[PDB]
Structure 1
Amino acid sequence: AQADIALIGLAVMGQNLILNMNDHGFVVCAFNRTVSKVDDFLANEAKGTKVLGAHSLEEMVSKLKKPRRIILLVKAGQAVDNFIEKLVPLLDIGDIIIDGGNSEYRDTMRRCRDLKDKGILFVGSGVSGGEDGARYGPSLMPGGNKEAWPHIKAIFQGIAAKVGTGEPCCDWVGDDGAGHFVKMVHNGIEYGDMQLICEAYHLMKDVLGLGHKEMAKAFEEWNKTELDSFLIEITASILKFQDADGKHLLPKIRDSAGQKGTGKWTAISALEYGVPVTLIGEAVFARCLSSLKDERIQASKKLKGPQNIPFEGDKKSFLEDIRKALYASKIISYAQGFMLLRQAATEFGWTLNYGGIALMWRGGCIIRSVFLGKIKDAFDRNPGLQNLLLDDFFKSAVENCQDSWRRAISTGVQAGIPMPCFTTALSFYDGYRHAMLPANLIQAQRDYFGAHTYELLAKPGQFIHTNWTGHGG
């Protein structure tokens, strides 16, 4: 009893989080599987702080004040279970284990129930913001057993990033896997915004012939409009950046995007629960497409594009159209993200506070922007809002962007520029707007070849099977 909390996992993220907590007046006791690293940290980065070091799990648990609070920041999967295995013999009923890794929400559900049975309070929190964010103010998204929450509130909300009006980008998300589910959706959305920016980038580069100086300028300009966001800002910096030889660095790097799993999982969840989260899906498949680098080099030699028609129009107006096409598409991505969140909530019985979630994403995290503020007061004005597009601000924003959005897509399609996310976002927008869709033909076909039955428009609920085949043979 002296340390308020322990953290296991002394990679840079773990180190920065302990330092942040120490700076906020909390005595942290550090531990790591390779025990050497605890000494190293105390002699170096934590020299002259209040952090304690442990050299065995038993010593770490003796150091903790009761209810003992311990954070796991190890590689998601097996290791989290192994540490739980060790820790549970050593803990009293009412102690708290927190998993901060990017765990599978179903594993977190599992572990939360299991430990609840043994009287140990389990919380899974998403942590967002990279290593420097961890150092000064991460978004923390905790969920699991709420009895833990009053005992960690102070620590979590104290080290969390704070929005201009003082609030922490951290609050209790919900039961069992809710914090981790919100975390993976966060990353799904991140993928979506990155791909949208890549498509804007591709239109300016290849339709408008803009060099990276002018392109970085255009992005800094955009970072002063509604598109004000961390990602637009760093993109301007990346486009400017010069390598050791004075030439721009971005054109020299390989176009094969990596993935670590969370994006993929958002798409898979949308498919499992039947939610049309089409833009994150396209973003994930666009990373898959770029991985096929060698295949694409072969294809460029064989497959022909459209007739090369030079852009004949005003560069400034078109650059504005790209601005609006990105903004409208981003609106659709976020509407789809909150549709998934909403569906997961009825699927697992979570009572999510959507305005709360938007606030947790307003600062600290990679998707932070002024835009999340507008989403938050959409849900403040109406917390039962079914879809973001029905909110007057978003509805007016899309209406305003509309023919620039259509103009940018048509020009891209004429010029042969791949726009998977710009086009999904418009297709979804036009799908969702239509009270009557051609899906009635799907239903008629399925009834025709596999008797699956259909409903009439007037009289929903009664299912009919027409004998199409021969209606008079």
Structure 2
Amino acid sequence: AQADIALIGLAVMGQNLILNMNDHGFVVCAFNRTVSKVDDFLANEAKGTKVLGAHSLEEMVSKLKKPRRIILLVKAGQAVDNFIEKLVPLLDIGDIIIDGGNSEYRDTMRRCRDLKDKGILFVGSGVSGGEDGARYGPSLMPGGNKEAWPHIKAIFQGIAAKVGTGEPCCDWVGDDGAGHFVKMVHNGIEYGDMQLICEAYHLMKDVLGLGHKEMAKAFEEWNKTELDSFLIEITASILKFQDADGKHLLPKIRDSAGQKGTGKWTAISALEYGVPVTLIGEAVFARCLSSLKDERIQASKKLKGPQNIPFEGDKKSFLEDIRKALYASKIISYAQGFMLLRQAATEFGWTLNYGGIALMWRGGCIIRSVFLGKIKDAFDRNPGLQNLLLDDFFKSAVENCQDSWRRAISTGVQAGIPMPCFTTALSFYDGYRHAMLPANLIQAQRDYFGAHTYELLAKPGQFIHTNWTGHGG
């Protein structure tokens, strides 16, 4: 009794969350497996604060006020499990472990269940924002065992980022893996937004022949419109940045996009649970494509492009078309993301508050934007909205953009600019608007070669198998 909460894991993320925590008047006891790290932090970044250190897992446990509350901000995987094993013998029934690492929603569920019967309340939380966010106000997404929530509410919401009306970008997400499932869908969406920005970049660079200087200006103009977001803002900075030598740094960087795995999971989840989250799929795959750098070098030497027609038209107009095409496509993957969230909710029995989640992504996290605010009051006005595209704001915004959107894509297609995400968003949009789709032909084929049966348009329910093979032979 003295420390309010413990944090294990002293890399920059843990470090900054403890300082953030301390600034809101919480005594935190630090610990790390390379114990020397605890000293180093106490004498350096945490010198002159109220944070205590522990040199043994056992004395860390000793410092805590009951219910003991300890946070793991350790590498996801095995590491988290090891710590749980060691922690459980020392803790009392009713104690709380939070895993803040980017964990697998399934590993979280398992752990949550497992700890319930040993009387230990487990919460898996998504943390977003990076070092900066960690330090002044991260976005936090806690889920797991709801009994832990009243014991941690004050800390998490206190250090959480705050939206303009002072609400925290943190609230209870739901049971077991919910917080960790929300965290990864956030990253899926993050991948999506980035690829969309790249596509817009690629069209103004190759079709419009803009230099990085003008392209930064155009993004900066765009950040004053509906597109106002952290990502459009940093993109304008990146395009302007000049290296030591005076020339722009971005053209020097190698185009193989890495990925630490979370985006991958969103798209795999959609595939497992049957949700058309096509834009995040294309975004993950566009990263896979860029990894085949040497292969694209070799392919560029021999695969021919379209005939070169120079762009004739008003650059200012096309620039505006690219803006609206980005915006409509962004609306589309957010509609795909929240329908994945709805399906997962249905699969695992979570009562998700989608306006709540919108608010949690409104600040702190990388995808923060004014856009998320508009999503929040769509679900406020109607919490049972099946799909974002049916809310009048989005239905109006997309309707309003579609001319430009189709123009932007036709030009790209003729010019040979790769647009994975612009094209899936439009395909999906046109797919979803259609009451009748050619899917009935798939059914006919499936029934024909594999006898799989089909149902009629009127009288859904009965499955028929036609004998196509011969009908008069």
TM range (shorter): over 0.9
Partners of 2:158 and 2:430 in 1: how far apart? 44
Partners of 2:238 and 2:185 in 1: how far apart? 25
TM-superposed deviation, 1:337: 0.1
TM-superposed deviation, 1:61: 0.2
TM-superposed deviation, 1:66: 0.0
Partners of 1:211 and 1:319 in 2: how far apart? 13
Residue deviations 1:296-321 (CA, integer Å, cap 9, x gap): 00000000000000000000000000
TM-superposed deviation, 1:463: 0.2
Give the number of aligned pairs: 473
Structure 1 counterpart SS, 2:147: coil
Residue deviations 1:245-296 (CA, integer Å, cap 9, x gap): 0000000000000000100000000000000000000000000000000000
Q: Which residue of 1 aligns with 2:396?
A: 396
Residue deviations 1:136-167 (CA, integer Å, cap 9, x gap): 00000000000000000000000000000010
Identity of counterpart residues, as a percentage?
100
TM-score by length of 1: 1.00
Structure 1 counterpart SS, 2:115: helix
Residue deviations 1:378-414 (CA, integer Å, cap 9, x gap): 0000000000000000000000000100000000000
TM-superposed deviation, 1:169: 0.1
Q: Is 1:374–2:355 an aligned residue pair?
A: no
Q: Is 1:465–2:465 an aligned residue pair?
A: yes
Gap regions ≥5 residues in structure 1: none
Structure 1 counterpart SS, 2:127: strand
Partners of 2:278 and 2:141 in 1: how far apart? 25
Alignment of 1:38-187 (within 5 A): 38-187=38-187
TM-superposed deviation, 1:329: 0.1
TM-superposed deviation, 1:457: 0.2
Gap regions ≥5 residues in structure 2: none
Partners of 2:186 and 2:174 in 1: how far apart? 16
TM-superposed deviation, 1:332: 0.1
Structure 1 counterpart SS, 2:275: coil
Residue deviations 1:86-130 (CA, integer Å, cap 9, x gap): 000000000000000000000000000000010000000000000
TM-score by length of 2: 1.00
Runs of 4+ in structure 1 deviating by more than 3 angstroms, as ranges, are none
TM-superposed deviation, 1:244: 0.2
Structure 2 counterpart SS, 1:448: helix
Q: Which residue of 1 aligns with 2:418?
A: 418
Partners of 1:76 and 1:16 in 2: how far apart? 18
TM-superposed deviation, 1:439: 0.1
TM-superposed deviation, 1:187: 0.2
Partners of 1:226 and 1:132 in 2: how far apart? 25
TM-superposed deviation, 1:14: 0.2
Residue deviations 1:40-97 (CA, integer Å, cap 9, x gap): 0000000000000000000000000000000000000000000000000000000000
Partners of 2:418 and 2:167 in 1: how far apart? 41
Alignment of 1:73-472 (within 5 A): 73-472=73-472
Partners of 2:155 and 2:381 in 1: how far apart? 30
Partners of 1:166 and 1:30 in 2: how far apart? 29
Partners of 1:252 and 1:450 in 2: how far apart? 53
Structure 1 counterpart SS, 2:6: strand
Alignment root-mean-square deviation, CA: 0.2
TM-superposed deviation, 1:469: 0.5
TM-superposed deviation, 1:358: 0.3
Structure 2 counterpart SS, 1:290: helix
Partners of 2:100 and 2:145 in 1: how far apart? 14
Partners of 2:330 and 2:253 in 1: how far apart? 26
Residue deviations 1:16-51 (CA, integer Å, cap 9, x gap): 000000000000000000000000000000000000
Partners of 1:434 and 1:409 in 2: how far apart? 20
Partners of 1:134 and 1:380 in 2: how far apart? 28
Structure 1 counterpart SS, 2:445: helix
Partners of 1:294 and 1:388 in 2: how far apart? 41
Structure 2 counterpart SS, 1:302: coil
Residue deviations 1:171-210 (CA, integer Å, cap 9, x gap): 0000000000000000000000000000000000000000
Partners of 2:333 and 2:113 in 1: how far apart? 33
Partners of 1:126 and 1:312 in 2: how far apart? 48
Structure 2 counterpart SS, 1:148: helix
Partners of 1:321 and 1:118 in 2: how far apart? 58
TM-superposed deviation, 1:219: 0.2
